[PDB]
Amino acid sequence: EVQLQESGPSLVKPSQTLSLTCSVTGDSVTSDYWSWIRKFPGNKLEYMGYISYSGSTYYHPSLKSRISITRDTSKNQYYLQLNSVTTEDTATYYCASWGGDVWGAGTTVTVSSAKTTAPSVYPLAPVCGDTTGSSVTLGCLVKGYFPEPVTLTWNSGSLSSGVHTFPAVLQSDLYTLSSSVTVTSSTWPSQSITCNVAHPASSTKVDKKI
């Protein structure tokens, strides 16, 4: 009987130190050993270290002296502290019982020096030579924003079928993503299609009719 939940800032600069919290509910933090696990891109899992039911800690030798795992017996929580972080520490962090029997939901932490930047939203309209088929594909290009995420929809959500919104990628510290939508050719451009982009961090919410 135990539930785990991670919490903490999702954006840490190379000039700062990282701190994540795992809240243990059900049994006491003193009733088992607990670990911190992280998954880097490329599905590379790393067992960072663990803290026993008594407070003893053990750390992955590769994180040598950069890591500190602590606990608070009064609040039934334990923490991950990581200093001298770099973009290489960008990953999904999870807390779990040391045997993997119970895990938290996981939380993302991105390490970057990038400044908050609103995205540019560009239309991807069919070339004249590719509008002769049964269907037509249009697109929307979202470039140069930070940090993630952005939320992109088509016609404010009424258009959801035949959509492919790709994962964002980095371009010199700024993110970019594109989305394609495919509809029957006879209905477009007569029945308009609009790309809607929201970037909470820069308080951006725009619509671009393709």
Partner: protein, 214 residues
């Protein structure tokens, strides 16, 4: 440290089929081996403990065996909810380590990609950028090669690709390939081509446009 090698890298199966995943340790680790299943935006889930110990709540079709340096995870009669990543982890020696994982995907009939190319928008050009976008959608298998050609010459720098995970509805894959140039360079050439080479066609699928046309 202990290196765990999982194979195959990817497994394409039909539902109802029985599969077996491998995990080899670079050293004998007795029976201190554990198996996990992990889905997108989801934490790993313990499937098997200490090589063959069953875990409460986990389906019957899941079983593990092995010892020392060789271990195998078997899924008898795979169901639709079993697709995803599978990792093995050793707890024999510190640091505890994970294998690279084996992706279990659903097999389907091969499907040719639908390829679409888009030139830079007038809006982006005004800002000085020139992104040429190419979508290669709903294809299978996932293996695909994309080549960008400018005035007939292959271009590699400035190209960024992004892939969607296998679609849970039609089991296909889609990808976007974007050639990002500056307006300065974009306007010094005429022909832009996105070429896709895929198992579903003897010849590559070509989509192109000329700046001097439309």
């Amino acid at each position: 440290d202990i290196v765990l090698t999982q194979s195959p890298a990817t497994l394409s199966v039909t539902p109802g089929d029985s599969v077996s995943l491998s995990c080899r340790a670079s050293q004998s680790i007795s029976n201190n081996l554990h198996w996990y299943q992990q889905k997108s935006h989801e934490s790993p889930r313990l499937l098997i403990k200490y090589a063959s110990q069953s875990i409460s709540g986990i389906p019957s079709r899941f079983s593990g065996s092995g010892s020392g340096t060789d271990f195998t995870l078997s899924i008898n009669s795979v169901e639709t909810e079993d697709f995803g990543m599978y990792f093995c982890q050793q707890s024999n020696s510190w640091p505890y380590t994970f294998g690279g994982g084996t992706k279990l995907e659903i097999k389907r009939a091969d499907a040719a990609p639908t390829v679409s190319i888009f030139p830079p928008s007038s809006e982006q050009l005004t800002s000085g950028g020139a992104s040429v976008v190419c979508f290669l959608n709903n294809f299978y298998p996932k293996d695909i090669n994309v080549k960008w050609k400018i005035d007939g010459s292959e271009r590699q720098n400035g190209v960024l690709n992004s892939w969607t995970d296998q679609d849970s509805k039609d089991s296909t894959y889609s990808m976007s390939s974007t050639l990002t140039l500056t307006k300065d360079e974009y306007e010094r050439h005429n022909s832009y081509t996105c070429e896709a080479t895929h198992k579903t066609s003897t010849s590559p699928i070509v989509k192109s446009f000329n700046r001097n046309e439309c």
